[PDB]
């Protein structure tokens with residue numbers, strides 16, 4: 001579990017979005033496993049605006065933050081998970097690291113702020129859904 005809290009927006013894995021998220025929907029994309037909902041209080045997170053490929057991510061199944069190198073976002077064949085079929089996911093970044101299903105929502109951060117959230121796992125990789133192309137998270 002985990003979210004990004006930027007302005008009056010809550011960014012979560014689409015597959016973990018709650019009824020309240022869907023009832024207060026701003027934007028969602030199944031291809032990228034992302035959903036954004038509205039918030040009452042303003043959030044503490046800043047979104048990175050950058051092409052960094054190094055950062056740190058939180059791994060709940062280890063209670064640890066790990067430094068990683070990651071790819072720029074791509075269309076990656078993701079093997080079957082407990083929450084998704086074997087399928088293609090867009091705007092996905094991969095790193096070598098530990099990821100189990102419950103690690104979804106962990107933040108990846110660079111020197112510029114929040115890059116994305118854990119979205120995929122298995123076979124010694126962790127995948128992150130990128131948010132840095134969502135400039136509209138910074139305004140309105």
Ligand SMILES: CN1CCCc2ccc(S(N)(=O)=O)cc21
Pocket residue numbers: 073074075076089090091092133
């Ligand atoms: C929209 N466009 C161009 C700019 C950045 C970017 C990154 C990933 C993907 S993709 N192939 O995962 O849909 C598409 C894309």
Ligand SMILES: [Zn+2]
Pocket residue numbers: 048049050051052110111112113
């Ligand atoms: Zn950066």
